[PDB]
Amino acid sequence: IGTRWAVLIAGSKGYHNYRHQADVCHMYQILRKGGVKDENIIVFMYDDIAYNESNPFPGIIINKPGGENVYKGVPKDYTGEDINNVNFLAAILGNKSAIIGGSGKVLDTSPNDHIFIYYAXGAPGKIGMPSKPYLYADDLVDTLKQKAATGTYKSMVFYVEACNAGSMFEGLLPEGTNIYAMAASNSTEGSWITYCPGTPDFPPEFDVCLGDLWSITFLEDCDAHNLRTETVHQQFELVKKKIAYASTVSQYGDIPISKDSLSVYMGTDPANDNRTFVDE
Ligand SMILES: *[C@@H]1O[C@H](CO)[C@@H](O[C@@H]2O[C@H](CO)[C@@H](O[C@H]3O[C@H](CO)[C@@H](O)[C@H](O)[C@@H]3O)[C@H](O)[C@H]2NC(C)=O)[C@H](O)[C@H]1NC(C)=O
Numbered sequence: 001i002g003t004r005w006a007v008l009i010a011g012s013k014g015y016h017n018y019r020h021q022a023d024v025c026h027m028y029q030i031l032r033k034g035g036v037k038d039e040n041i042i043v044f045m046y047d048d049i050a051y052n053e054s055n056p057f058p059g060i061i062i063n064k065p066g067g068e069n070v071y072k073g074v075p076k077d078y079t080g081e082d083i084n085n086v087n088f089l090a091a092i093l094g095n096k097s098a099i100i101g102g103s104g105k106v107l108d109t110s111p112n113d114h115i116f117i118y119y120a121x122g123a124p125g126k127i128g129m130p131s132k133p134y135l136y137a138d139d140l141v142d143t144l145k146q147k148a149a150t151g152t153y154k155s156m157v158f159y160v161e162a163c164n165a166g167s168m169f170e171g172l173l174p175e176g177t178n179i180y181a182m183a184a185s186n187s188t189e190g191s192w193i194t195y196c197p198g199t200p201d202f203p204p205e206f207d208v209c210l211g212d213l214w215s216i217t218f219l220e221d222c223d224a225h226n227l228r229t230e231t232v233h234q235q236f237e238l239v240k241k242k243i244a245y246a247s248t249v250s251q252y253g254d255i256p257i258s259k260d261s262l263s264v265y266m267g268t269d270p271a272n273d274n275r276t277f278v279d280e
C-alpha cells in the first residue's frame, strides 16, 4: 500500500502575494483531513503573511471570503530565504545532506509510495522563488528524472499554479516514469487571480486577493467529495471546463496515472463519505 507524501511550496514572498501562501495552507488542510501525516508533508512558505503588519486578522489566513483559518496547524519546514532551488530540489530528491537550513524534512520515499507536489506562485520556462535565482524548466525536470532513476516512488502527481505553467513540462517531462503533471495554464497563457477586493461578502480591510482561480477551483473541489470516487482525470476535466474562460488547464507526463482516485494522493475526509462525485 505504501505511504502518501506531499511537497507544498509557495514560491513567492510579500504581503501582496498573500494568495500563494493561502492556497498552499489550504492544500495542507485537505491532506490533514485525508489522513496524510505531517512527517510526510514538506511545507515551503515564506511565513510573512499571518503576522504581517498589514494583516487585518493576525494569526489567520483565509483562502476564500468567509473561509476557515487555513494557517492553523500548518507545519513549516522551509521559511524565509530557505525556500530556494537548492532546498526544493534536494527535498524532492530526498537528499538530506544537501539541505541548507530549515527542518531537514525531505522525500525519503520507498518504491510503493505516492507523491503529491503542489507549487503556487511564472514566466516561459521558469517559476519563481522568493529571491533570484528562479527555477528553470530543465533544472526541475532533471531532478524529476534523477528521482525516477532511483525508483523510490510508485507514482507522482505534480500540480502547478503559475503563469505559463505548461512551459515547465511541455516537451520535457517523460511519459513513462509515473509522473503526471497538471498546470493552471498552457505555456503561452497567464493565470488568473480571484477573490479580489470588491467581490460580495469580502472581509473588510483586505486590499489583497485571497486566492488563485485554478487553485481555489481544484481545492474547493477536493473539499466537496469523497475522493475515492473522483479520479485525477475527472478533476482535470471538471476544472478545465469550469475555468476555460480564463486559462487552458493543461496536462503532461504519464497521462494514465491520472486514472487513480484523488484519494490515492490526498486521502479523503471521513465527513464526506456519502458525497459521491457526479459526472466525469
Ligand atoms: C509584511 O509584508 C511586507 C510587504 O510585503 C514586508 O516588507 C518587506 O520587508 C522585506 C524584508 O524586510 C523588505 O526587503 C528588504 O531586503 C532586501 C535585501 O535582501 C533589500 O534590498 C530591500 O530593499 C529591503 O530592504 C521589503 O523591502 C519590504 N517590502 C515593502 C513593500 O515594504 C514585511 O517584511 C512583512 N512583515 C512581516 C512581519 O513579515
Ligand SMILES: *[C@@H]1O[C@H](CO)[C@@H](O)[C@H](O)[C@H]1NC(C)=O
Binding pocket: 095, 097, 098
Ligand atoms: C547529495 O548532496 C551532497 C552534498 O552536496 C552530494 O555530494 C551528493 O552527491 C548528493 N547526492 C546525490 C546522489 O545527488
Ligand SMILES: *[C@@H]1O[C@H](CO)[C@@H](O)[C@H](O)[C@H]1NC(C)=O
Binding pocket: 186, 187, 188, 248, 250
Ligand atoms: C496549448 O494547448 C492547446 C491544446 O492542445 C495546443 O493546441 C497549443 O499548441 C498549446 N499552446 C499554444 C497556443 O501554442
